[PDB]
């Protein structure tokens, strides 16, 4: 019934720091399949991050391309992401990302963001990637991904604390949140995500981004529903920096990401949602104190 797909780079070798390689893999069937596990084949000393997308039109036809060219032409739904030697990610029973079928993606696209060019003095060839475990047994609970991401953060040099706040109004069919992944680069201290319902903040996740950036389970899994606000804060420092630090594509720039894995009932399910905004900036007046206390490793 099941099968696995090994999505690995074809022996690539970067020639400069912060190089982004992308490749695609066709789903071997067109009928409906479900992704239930993710096993990364990758290490921090070479790879800054991987992202895995579902789509129907990959941005190029070659064995691999530079990701500046695009990931997918159509909507690239994020399935999975990885960074700091995170262990495998396994979905709760009855839950899988839905691919193939009339509705679903026919291609995976893998982005690998390689780190420092030191790791290739060697000139070795790289086969980093993910192995994915699909099943054709229909799952009643379809997983999707909600990405909260900052696009305007400036971290002035040396400032002890900078908060980066992300908030969107939730207006879709009910989702049920069960795991999360936080991401920053070297300046990030703690990253927190919340569901805010009538002034009451309900923790989704709180993690140190310097720990392996796994999909950690949501301690008390929670419904997010029409009318709610989803809110996240990354706490940064400017210490150890000469100039301002901007949001960017290299390991010396910053990023504030919260990835929330959710499920929905098959019939009304959505794959991928996005917040790159801060709609409700004064709402953070009452964010809990825990969002600015660091998690001591
Ligand atoms: Cu990054």
Q: Could you tell me the distance, in angstroms and rounded to a whole number, from the CA of residue 101 to the centre of ligand 1?
A: 32
154 and 103 within one domain: no
Residue ending a domain, among 108, 143, 178, is 143
Beta-strand ranges (E) seen in 215-265 are 216-224, 229-236, 245-246, 257-265
The technique by which this structure was obtained is X-ray
Q: What protein residues have CB closer than 5 angstroms to ion ligand 1? A: 255
- Cα distances from 195 to residues 95, 178, 208, 223, in angstroms, run 22, 13, 19, 9
Q: Please compute, for residue 166, the number of CA atoms within 13 A of its CA located in the half-sphere on the CB side.
A: 24
- Resolution to one decimal, Å: 2.6
User: What sign does the dihedral 117-118-122-128 (CA atoms) show?
Assistant: negative
Determine contact, residues 42/60, Cβ cutoff 8 Å: no
CB 286: neighbour CB atoms within 10 A? Answer: 10
202 and 138 within one domain: no
Determine contact, residues 234/184, Cβ cutoff 8 Å: yes
Residue ending a domain, among 75, 110, 143, is 143
Q: Could you tell me the distance, in angstroms and rounded to a whole number, from the CA of residue 184 to the centre of ligand 1?
A: 6
Which H/E stretch holds residue 49? strand 47-55
Q: Could you tell me the distance, in angstroms and rounded to a whole number, from the CA of residue 49 to the centre of ligand 1?
A: 6
Q: Which domain holds residue 261?
A: 144-294
151 and 136 within one domain: no
Q: Could you tell me the distance, in angstroms and rounded to a whole number, from the CA of residue 48 to the centre of ligand 1?
A: 7
158 and 98 within one domain: no
135 and 3 within one domain: yes
Q: Could you tell me the distance, in angstroms and rounded to a whole number, from the CA of residue 263 to the centre of ligand 1?
A: 25
Q: Could you tell me the distance, in angstroms and rounded to a whole number, from the CA of residue 267 to the centre of ligand 1?
A: 34
Q: Could you tell me the distance, in angstroms and rounded to a whole number, from the CA of residue 15 to the centre of ligand 1?
A: 19
194 and 111 within one domain: no
Residue ending a domain, among 80, 113, 143, is 143
Q: Could you tell me the distance, in angstroms and rounded to a whole number, from the CA of residue 2 to the centre of ligand 1?
A: 32
How many domains in the chain?
2
d(CA 217, CA 133): 19
């Amino acid at each position: 019934s099941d099968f696995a797909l090994d999505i690995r780079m074809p022996g690539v070798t970067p020639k400069e720091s912060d190089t982004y390689f992308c490749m695609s893999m066709r789903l071997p069937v067109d009928e409906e399949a479900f992704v239930i596990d993710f096993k990364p084949r990758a290490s921090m000393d070479t790879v800054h991050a991987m992202l895995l997308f579902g789509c129907n039109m990959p941005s190029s036809t070659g064995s691999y391309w530079f990701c500046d060219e695009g990931t997918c032409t159509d909507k690239a739904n994020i399935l999975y992401a990885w960074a700091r030697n995170a262990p495998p990610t396994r979905l709760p029973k009855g839950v899988g990302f839905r691919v193939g079928g009339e509705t679903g993606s026919k291609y995976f696209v893998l982005q690998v963001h390689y780190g420092d060019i030191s790791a290739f003095r060697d000139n070795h060839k790289d086969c980093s990637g993910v192995s994915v475990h699909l099943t054709r047994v229909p799952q009643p609970l379809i997983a999707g991904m909600y990405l909260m991401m900052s696009v305007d953060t400036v971290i002035p040099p040396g400032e002890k604390v900078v908060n980066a706040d992300i908030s969107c109004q939730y207006k879709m069919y009910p989702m049920h949140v069960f795991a999360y992944r936080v991401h920053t680069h070297h300046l990030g201290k703690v990253v927190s995500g919340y569901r805010v319902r009538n002034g009451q903040w309900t923790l989704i996740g709180r993690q140190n981004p310097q720990l392996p950036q796994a999909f950690y389970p949501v301690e008390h899994p929670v419904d997010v529903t029409f009318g709610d606000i989803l809110a996240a804060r990354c706490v940064f420092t400017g210490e150890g920096r000469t100039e301002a630090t901007h949001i960017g594509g290299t390991s010396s720039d910053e990023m504030c990401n919260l990835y929330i894995m959710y499920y929905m009932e098959a019939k009304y399910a959505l794959s991928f949602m996005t917040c790159t905004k801060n709609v409700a900036p004064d709402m953070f007046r009452t964010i809990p104190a825990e969002a600015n206390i660091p998690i001591p490793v």
